[PDB]
Design a protein around this ligand. Structure first.
Ligand SMILES: [Ca+2]
Ligand SMILES: [Zn+2]
Length: 150
């Protein structure tokens, strides 16, 4: 269980390559038809910042849900008392560089619920083993994980 290092990513290739999360498919919108592909995650074992208060955070694809929920489990087991925390989910706001998987509900930024920056390296390792298609120690303040489109 070798935690990831700052700026490290597993698998060791570019996020949108085929061996990872795959191709950008197109910004999903509130109104657009694809939007119905998103369902809200109401997992009580997961903490959603939701600074938008829109509930956008909870909105993700099914695969993204699946992996996030597995990760929720292994996080508690790993550090009892602590829970998984999502800081950023689906983006309506448009504050991600063009072609981010956030626009499609396929990517999340996470921390532990206590913001102990020391557990992040390990959090990323758990996200890899929860089955996230690309895991990346994007910042010292959060792990970025994303999933293939299905
Ligand atoms: Ca948020
Ligand atoms: Zn991200």
């Amino acid at each position: 269980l070798t935690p990831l290092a700052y700026k490290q990513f597993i698998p060791n290739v570019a996020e949108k390559t085929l061996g990872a999360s795959g191709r950008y498919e197109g910004k999903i919108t509130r109104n657009s038809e694809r939007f119905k592909e998103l369902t809200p995650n109401y997992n009580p074992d997961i903490i959603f910042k939701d600074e938008e208060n829109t509930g956008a955070d909870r909105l993700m694809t099914q695969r993204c849900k699946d992996k996030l929920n597995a990760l929720a489990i292994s996080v508690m087991n790993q550090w009892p008392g602590v829970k998984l925390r999502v800081t950023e989910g689906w983006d309506e706001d448009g504050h991600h560089s063009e072609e981010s998987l956030h626009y499609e509900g396929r990517a999340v930024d996470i921390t532990t619920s206590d913001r102990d920056r020391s557990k992040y390296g390990m959090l990323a390792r758990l996200a890899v083993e929860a089955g996230f298609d690309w895991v990346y120690y994007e910042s010292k303040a959060h792990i970025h994980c994303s999933v293939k489109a299905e």
